[PDB]
Every structure is written in structure tokens, then in C-alpha cells.
């Protein structure tokens, strides 16, 4: 919602574990383990910028991730993040995420990568053996063949 602890608490709430709708209370090491899992999942998604970009901020090497650090995700990315976190940490508590949670996580990941896929759908420039036709007046500048890609 606003910090990594919130992403963990909402994910646990979705799974039905450690939520105030069932009078269940939280364990601090559950927070620590789920934050570590969230960090690992976000890093695996990111792949140092070669994968999905969500605006998530990763804790530096010197300071281990904590509950109170802001996630930095966009307002349209929180839902997918905590749904996928719940799916990932479901086996932790000997549980399997319901079909609705899995479907929501898949839909959220699709929506996260939609804009990146649109941005990365860029055509390559013309080949290096393509001639610039006589209709281009820049041909007079000795630019008879295209620049290489």
C-alpha cells in the first residue's frame, strides 16, 4: 500500500493468515521472511533492468531490507505485487493459494508488463545494404544507401 510491510500484510491478509478478519495476529519473523521473499521476487522480476520495471526500490547491500522502507511502486502496481507475494509465500504456511488469487496475480503481471512490452516493441532501423530511393532529396548529399543499424 505504502511500504513493503504493507505489501506483506496485505498479501498475508489475502491468504487468510495473520489478518484481523479472523482475529489472527502477526509474528515479526513472518514479516522478516516475507520481506526477504518480496525482495528476492522483485529482484528476479527486474533482472537489473532487463525484465519488468515496476519502480520498486531495492535496499542497498549495507542496509538489509526492513519493514518500514517505502516500496516506491506505482499506484497501479501494488495489487499485482502483493497478490504475487501471497502466491509465493503460500507454500510457506503449508497452504495453496486459491484460484482467484492466482488468476489475479497473473492478470496483474500481464498489466505490469503491458506498458513495457509496448515500449520495447520498437522496429529495427533500415538495413545497411538498403538504398535510399531517388525520391529522397537527401540523396544529393551522397546518402544513396542507408546508415547501418
Amino acid at each position: 500500500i505504502k511500504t513493503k510491510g504493507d505489501l506483506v500484510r496485505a498479501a498475508l491478509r489475502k491468504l487468510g493468515v495473520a489478518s484481523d478478519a479472523t482475529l489472527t495476529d502477526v509474528e515479526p519473523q513472518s514479516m522478516q521472511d516475507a520481506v526477504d521473499d518480496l525482495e528476492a521476487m522483485m529482484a528476479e522480476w527486474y533482472q537489473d533492468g532487463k525484465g519488468i520495471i515496476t519502480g520498486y526500490v531495492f535496499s542497498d547491500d549495507e542496509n538489509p531490507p526492513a519493514e518500514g522502507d517505502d516500496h516506491g511502486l506505482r499506484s497501479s502496481a501494488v495489487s499485482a505485487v502483493f497478490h504475487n507475494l501471497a502466491c509465493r509465500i503460500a507454500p510457506d504456511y503449508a497452504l495453496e493459494a486459491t484460484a482467484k488469487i492466482i488468476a489475479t496475480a497473473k492478470y496483474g503481471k500481464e498489466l505490469l508488463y503491458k506498458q513495457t512490452a509496448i515500449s520495447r516493441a520498437k522496429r529495427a532501423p533500415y538495413p545497411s545494404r538498403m538504398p535510399t530511393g531517388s525520391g529522397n532529396s537527401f540523396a544529393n548529399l551522397n546518402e544513396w544507401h542507408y546508415f547501418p543499424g
Binding site: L111, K114, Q115, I118, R123
Partner: protein, 52 residues
């Protein structure tokens, strides 16, 4: 009788068939893919006709 009296029916039928075929050419919707609105949701500037 002259020469254009017995060709009236055939010529009228020819004109009617040509008019019907021109109507078919003009008013028939062209060939475009059938898409669900959810299939292309967010990807709707890729099917506009651009080659980008």
C-alpha cells in the same frame, strides 16, 4: 420494329445486374479481423494501420 426493341430486356437486365454488383462492391463491409474488446485492451494503437 427497329433494331433496339428486342434488346431492351437484355440491356435492362445487364444494367440491373451491374447496379446490384456496384452496390455489393460499395456497401459490403471490408475484411477486418474479429476481435474481442478484451483481447486488444491496451494494444489498440497497434492495429490502427501504422507500420511502426
Amino acid at each position: 420494329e427497329g433494331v433496339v426493341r428486342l434488346t431492351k430486356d437484355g440491356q435492362r437486365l445487364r444494367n440491373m445486374i451491374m447496379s446490384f454488383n456496384a452496390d455489393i462492391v460499395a456497401r459490403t463491409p471490408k475484411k477486418k479481423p474479429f476481435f474481442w474488446p478484451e483481447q486488444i485492451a491496451g494494444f489498440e494503437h497497434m492495429y490502427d494501420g501504422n507500420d511502426d
